[PDB]
Amino acid sequence: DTMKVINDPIHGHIELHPLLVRIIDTPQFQRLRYIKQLGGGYYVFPGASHNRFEHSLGVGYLAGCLVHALGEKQPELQISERDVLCVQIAGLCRNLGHGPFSHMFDGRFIPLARPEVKWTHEQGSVMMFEHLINSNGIKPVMEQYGLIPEEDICFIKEQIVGPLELWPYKGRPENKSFLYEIVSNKRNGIDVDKWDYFARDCHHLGIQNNFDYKRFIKFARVCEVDNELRICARDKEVGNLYDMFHTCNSLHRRAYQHKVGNIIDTMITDAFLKADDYIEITGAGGKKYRISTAIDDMEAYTKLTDNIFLEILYSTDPKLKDAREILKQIEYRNLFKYVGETQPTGQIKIKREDYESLPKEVASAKPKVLLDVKLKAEDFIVDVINMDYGMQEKNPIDHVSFYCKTAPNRAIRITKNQVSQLLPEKFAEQLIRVYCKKVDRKSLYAARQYFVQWCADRNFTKPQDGDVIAPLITPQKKEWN
Amino acid sequence: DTMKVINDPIHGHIELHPLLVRIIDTPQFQRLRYIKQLGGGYYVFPGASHNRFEHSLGVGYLAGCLVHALGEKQPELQISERDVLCVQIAGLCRNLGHGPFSHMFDGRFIPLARPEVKWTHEQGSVMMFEHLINSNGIKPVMEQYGLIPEEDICFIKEQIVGPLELWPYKGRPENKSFLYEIVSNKRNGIDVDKWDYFARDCHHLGIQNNFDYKRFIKFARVCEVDNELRICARDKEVGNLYDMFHTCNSLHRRAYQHKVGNIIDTMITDAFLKADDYIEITGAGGKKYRISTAIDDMEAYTKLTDNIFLEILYSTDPKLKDAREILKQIEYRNLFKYVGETQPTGQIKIKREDYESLPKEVASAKPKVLLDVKLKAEDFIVDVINMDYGMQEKNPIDHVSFYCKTAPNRAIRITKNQVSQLLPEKFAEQLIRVYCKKVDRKSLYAARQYFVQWCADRNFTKPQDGDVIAPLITPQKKEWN
Amino acid sequence: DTMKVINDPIHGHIELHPLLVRIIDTPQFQRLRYIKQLGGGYYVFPGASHNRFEHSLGVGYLAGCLVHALGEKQPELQISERDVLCVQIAGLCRNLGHGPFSHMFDGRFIPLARPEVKWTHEQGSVMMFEHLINSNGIKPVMEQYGLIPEEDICFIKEQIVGPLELWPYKGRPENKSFLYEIVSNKRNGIDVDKWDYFARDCHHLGIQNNFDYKRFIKFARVCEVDNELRICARDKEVGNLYDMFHTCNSLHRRAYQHKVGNIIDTMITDAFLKADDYIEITGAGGKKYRISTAIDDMEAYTKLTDNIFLEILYSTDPKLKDAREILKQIEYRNLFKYVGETQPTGQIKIKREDYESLPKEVASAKPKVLLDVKLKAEDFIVDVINMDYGMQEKNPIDHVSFYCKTAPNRAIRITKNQVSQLLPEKFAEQLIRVYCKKVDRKSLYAARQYFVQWCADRNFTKPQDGDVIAPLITPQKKEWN
Amino acid sequence: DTMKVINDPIHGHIELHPLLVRIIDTPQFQRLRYIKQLGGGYYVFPGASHNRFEHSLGVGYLAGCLVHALGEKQPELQISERDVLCVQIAGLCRNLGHGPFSHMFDGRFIPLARPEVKWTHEQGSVMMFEHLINSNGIKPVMEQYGLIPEEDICFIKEQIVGPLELWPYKGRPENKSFLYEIVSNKRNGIDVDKWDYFARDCHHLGIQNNFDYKRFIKFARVCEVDNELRICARDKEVGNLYDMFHTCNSLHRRAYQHKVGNIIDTMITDAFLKADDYIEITGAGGKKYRISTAIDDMEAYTKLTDNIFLEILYSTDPKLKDAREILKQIEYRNLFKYVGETQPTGQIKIKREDYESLPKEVASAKPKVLLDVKLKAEDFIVDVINMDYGMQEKNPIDHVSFYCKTAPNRAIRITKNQVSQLLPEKFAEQLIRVYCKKVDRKSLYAARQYFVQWCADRNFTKPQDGDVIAPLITPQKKEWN
Ligand SMILES: Nc1nc2c(ncn2[C@H]2C[C@H](O)[C@@H](COP(=O)(O)OP(=O)(O)OP(=O)(O)O)O2)c(=O)[nH]1
Ligand SMILES: Nc1nc2c(ncn2[C@H]2C[C@H](O)[C@@H](COP(=O)(O)OP(=O)(O)OP(=O)(O)O)O2)c(=O)[nH]1
Ligand SMILES: Nc1nc2c(ncn2[C@H]2C[C@H](O)[C@@H](COP(=O)(O)OP(=O)(O)OP(=O)(O)O)O2)c(=O)[nH]1
Ligand SMILES: Nc1nc2c(ncn2[C@H]2C[C@H](O)[C@@H](COP(=O)(O)OP(=O)(O)OP(=O)(O)O)O2)c(=O)[nH]1
């Protein structure tokens, strides 16, 4: 055959169609070898050395597995080789837009460097996909294997970012709506991107994943829902789906939002902001970009990877001294110090536009405790983390279709009360972590008093160690006693 | 070179002190080789071939690991070799009282054969332990290794069943209270027995365990709580403790309370009740016992194992024809056919004694459908399942002591609201299963109509497939529409 | 009836065609739930609780996987669903003939109980398969799914035992010759039966296997070899096939031929020989058989399982006292004591007829050391184990066909010298284990002197601990110095 | 505790003493986060993203485990906390000297760039260890925790490189000789560095390790050998040690010497040779070094990592155009083309002195075939691979001390003949791989004819695909027929 075989520790032997190999063997795809999946998490979990490259091969493989399983069970769906290849390409290419240290780049750096711009890795993936196709002559290779480039490039982009704008899609009609639920599920978040990273991250972190995606694929069918053909899970798998979201949330709490992994991502972002005026990345026509402007030119963005960290760390330029000093503090493990964690008790989230006021509010708290050192706004980092089941306040399982054994092609709905009284009553919450840039004993003691007083003033939850770190502050709050 | 080493697929190489080897190499302990850990579960999960013997080795190993870890971090606890051996023996011996097919025996058979008696496997473990020690001359071997048999045999039994009767224990004092939390934790259920069966059952079932017992052991300390020294977990582990109980509940729903596993245990129990007049087990002085009376004589109970199933299946005695016919139907997979599952609404909490009228109630339902068949009491089985976090309505984490990094000796409490708003708001519920002894198509159609009608009449939850199995019944209930 | 799914810890979710489910749900197949895969090995490796039932499901699954992979890559082979079902059934039923404790029954017991008869589990499998088909009305169900029972039952039997008697097979012609190398490979022993047991045993034993059967299946094709169509492996897999046989031999050394596992199997076989005059097994028309004659009647053999061990252990019959006493010594761990291991030198090979003389020869040795104890022939057990690569003196890889990427259509041969100088120069050897029934220190000291002297007298290899156990004997042998 | 815990996917929770944390949190140690364990192997096995950093934590952990196990079983050894910390430091620090892409750097690049110098990663580890200690004020911290830096730094260096010059060591006396066998075993190569890499590489590559280092540690003791106390293994582990070397060889055959991973390392080395003049690395006093001279100054070497690859790939400088074009061909997968593999027969050995002449010899072969293209020396790469059991022609197991259970303090030697006739007769062999820098069809056809002709002329082994790639050449050699 002309298929290549790649051995992966998660999936075993992955067979790749020659069109997929041509897409993978490009500078635009190979770039993902130099972007860590968990960014700063590697500095907490040493097994987490994995890159977006191997995750992308796994997403492309699982996308192919699911569409083949549906076509084998229900030939009447008329799934073509063309459909299979287009779903695999979208799976392979949905991580193309990631920047240095993955979620650090679009979650922390671009918001602070370029607040005027609205940028996501998903839009990056669509722009990088266009640059990959056009720079490497892929459209004629697509046609050679039976694809229709105009329709199928549209279909691939829609699978990653949704409608580029009643059926809102142009790449495929309503009778193939199920194809859009495999790579990036906009309806309920159940997709092969999560299935790969749960298993891969768990393998590398040394933590346990409870989600059985092979069982899910075996039980998956397509059903009619409101004039669309969609993916329906077997009714009895509903508990396994609730457990999938519980697992996702558990992996966010223990690993992806680890308090020290997040501070290392914050310190790396700070070094990038201090380096951004001085690093030059050449793009199209020899034009020079910066870390923050390389997102505007895919030829420049192609060369923007975790390498930026080492380019700064190893620099001799006096201009890069400040950026270099922050990364040196990461190496000596002189990190900003974790003060504590709290949650809002209210139902209205802290909004992103309020994030910058929060350090001033902590510094404005007046703890009734003797303090030697006085801290300022600039001494505090306040990190707000949205934890949910992928749909804000909504239950994603209310947006899943199920079938029963007696009518395997008829969609039904299952409510939370039909499953268990032991499930969550709420599907979204915020975590607030506070850190201090002053690392001495006296500064950290003070930071704790300001923190717990701010919690009390804002009616947030009592920090788990509140009575130990702030014994004179916690008694003032009756809700805490 | 006095110790023996056993290779276990869960724990790797387990070292056993010579005293432990002498206890294991007895007819009373080796009997656990012939009792399946999951009983009827093996007939649904063919990986689940494992027996109570290998689970017991694991419990004794983990009990040793925890007591050694505590002694090591806190030498001021004065943990002795004597304390370590007594904890390991209680760990190895806490499963000794299990009968044929494990929880089938004390969960289904003894309650129906001997309703007057209050029998648990734990009381069995204490009686079997006494018989093991006395039949095999163990007390002199205990003295040889520094144990004081009067105090230490009391300690071992108390670790399994609790106070044999202000400090209610005689085996060890208040300053060693923590030792009583290792093998069977009566305060919150967090103990090494669960840690072994999560990891061992997951390995055999082919399902994944997320609980990292090694991490928990590494972070565990002893703290002063109300004039006792108790085990305190690091504050940061509180999320991992909620996950442990989530995993336990997930394993109950998927595996231990599998609808078909439960009906096979029900059919085996029915065969045992029909064989009980005829089967003989030889006990002390050649006296004959029955399946139901072997619990009264430890020499007889020693020979009461899963072998009873095959003695019935292979019998030629006409008296055993009815018992043998039930087991033959298991082999042909002619099982009582699953009709569906429902839940009580409100706080309707069947605490037992109504199990007898439930089949009559289903048959008394009047579904508004044309049926060719009419079924009665003898055609229905109704199973009640209590699902909880081990303490009925209570949150076990409210009964855990934590410590913080800044004051490792100060016990604190952590409430659900200090952890996450995404946790369960309830910790207990009931499931109701219904099955039909008639297996033909006409009888199964009728049984479905009676079932869904009964659910509607009792205001139970709508069965997940209700609209497909009973399309003419479901519209009568508006709460369902 | 539709597909069933069984969750297996080795293979994950196995889908079973309704015809396969009907074959599995019979007393003849379900019997395999009560036969331990590794027999006495469970008494050394407590993870090894697995039975022939779950191994058989795995063999049927892998047989399906390989035939599907060949048919997918080479549609010109004309592989039919009929062919796939027949291969799966042969895979499922190849273990049907196993007796109590698997290889102990046909390897040790039947040869000693019935030396006149030639019995193998393979012949048993064919007889049990015939009994299963005829007793359970399978033929009509076969016809319903497109099988032709006359040809296809012949084909199934030939896959298990070979030609029942130029092409020697009647079930399929030469153009489907490759179908006969999947379930039981008579040409080189590379088959799906080994692939399942390596992975299953390793998972249960707690030991690691290096054989990637998925990779092998991915690279497998069918090639013309001397006017047959045979399975050909990719050239690059030749190293992995040498490693497969090294792994098998390693698992035999560590596990299947463990010295203590083998002595437990020896003691069980002795108990069975002592019980054989007295145990009655009812077969067809109420005729009575013995353990050794149940092989003559499949209705009797259906009820001959590991249960016979417990029937003896729990017996009160004075006739069974001697048999029962041996099994009681196993429970107390009063086993015959391993003295040592040696090998014949040069090409010297001990014949089966001479096994019985070996205990007398050891007892006839004259150590030339002062002993207070004299041992007799009856005090020694001598176990002779033939270790090979499954074809006696032959290299099985000389009987593999390979293909290169430059010409997938040209079958080639690869010699040992084309692969590595680090491979074995011999493919068969014999190990001789000696054990002593007298366990006291004086008796074992003496047994050691007799053993090392016998080795010296026969010119066998120096036992590894020779100089320590027999320091006065080892210097007399110059070939050892 | 002031101990840190690191979660590792191979070892679980690793506890680190504060002195070890101070050594790890340095630029010299953290550098190992940017060196791939398997270099070019990542470009063949996408799971192999792991770096030397996490391997080094595992080696330090296992070194601790082994020394603690010996001290617990044999307190009379008088193993001190000082001994344990010195062994852990040597374990952590033995990989410090690795350069970019690990074995590529000292195996391929330095020998070609600086043929006059004799450099190994081991010498690098000692020089960087000295730089780490001196640059970061570690000597005072060592004294604070009871180390004596004069003796103990000597001891650490000797563990990595051997005697810095019959007891040849100065760091510890003969009665602690066993300490020198833990991190880098110069006597037989059985050490904790291999144990970590087998498990860690197998986990990432997705291939299986069968070496059980925990079992080995459990059975290890210290014995008297020629006035030294050395590590003695249990005699029964001799089979498992032969298997350890077999696994090592298999990992080299499949992974570390993969033909494509080796050609990618060759192409990276070629890019580094083309860039060596132009890349400037600042060392001590602002002096500038090259890639090839950074080994001369540890301040420069600290900044020499896999980053060099990306600095070249992302350069715009015309000086780096040639180097950059080689790396761009790697990204497009336009690699030098593998022609074939052969071996010298019997004891024939190619020495390093031969390596440069080999391409000319292949080009000098005169295949009797019509060729369109004529190839030159410059068009061929010839890679010579030494495969052995770590001691050239010698059997490492002849250099192991064993002990038997009858006398645990008596060291014994076990020969190959006392173990098995199925073991290797030879412990060293050579592979010769030939590649072509011309990648078109006509040049590859020609290269194959020259290669197979050269094999025939030198009496090398027939390439496995010889009959297919060179059907007109193979007939000249009758031994090849
Ligand atoms: N599990 C496993 N994977 C292997 C082994 N050898 C290589 N691989 C992996 C490395 C790659 O991810 C993948 C493909 O390498 P292969 O040696 O199968 O093919 P390659 O293209 O190098 O050779 P070819 O062009 O077919 O001659 O398989 C092995 O023995 N076991
Ligand atoms: N992982 C592993 N387990 C093994 C191996 N050989 C034996 N075992 C298992 C079987 C038992 O559960 C445990 C102890 O068996 P051994 O063969 O070490 O001890 P045995 O008592 O037969 O020998 P001994 O009394 O020490 O001469 O280890 C092996 O090579 N690998
Ligand atoms: N991995 C895994 N296996 C499960 C789970 N639930 C059941 N199994 C296993 C048990 C059986 O070997 C296999 C199929 O059992 P199911 O519960 O799917 O089938 P059952 O015949 O009870 O249900 P059905 O006839 O389809 O209503 O899967 C689960 O949540 N995860
Ligand atoms: N297996 C496992 N590892 C975890 C989990 N949370 C964190 N880790 C890993 C990350 C690190 O490699 C190691 C120690 O991390 P911790 O979060 O326990 O330590 P950290 O220094 O952040 O907390 P501390 O200074 O003790 O408050 O454990 C978890 O839930 N499970």
Author numbering:
A (entry chain D), B (entry chain B), C (entry chain C), D (entry chain A): 113 to 277, 284 to 599
What does the published report state?
pmcSterile alpha motif (SAM) and histidine–aspartate (HD) domain–containing protein 1 (SAMHD1) is a dNTP triphosphohydrolase (dNTPase) that hydrolyzes dNTP substrates into their deoxynucleoside and triphosphate (TP) subparts. First, the enzymatically active SAMHD1 tetramer is formed when dGTP/GTP and dNTPs bind to two allosteric sites of SAMHD1, A1 and A2, respectively.
R366C, found in both colon cancer and leukemia, and R366H, found in colon cancer, are located in the enzyme's catalytic site. For both the R366C and R366H mutants, we crystallized the HD domain of SAMHD1 (residues 113–626) in the presence of dGTP, which is capable of binding both allosteric sites 1 and 2 as well as the catalytic site of SAMHD1 (29). An established catalytically inactive mutant (H206R/D207N; SAMHD1HD/RN) was used to prevent hydrolysis but retain binding capacity of dGTP during crystallization. However, unlike WT protein structure that displays dGTP substrate bound to the catalytic site, no nucleotide density was observed in the catalytic pocket of either mutant, thus confirming that substitution of a cysteine or histidine side chain at residue 366 renders SAMHD1HD/RN deficient in stably binding dGTP at the catalytic site despite tetramerization.
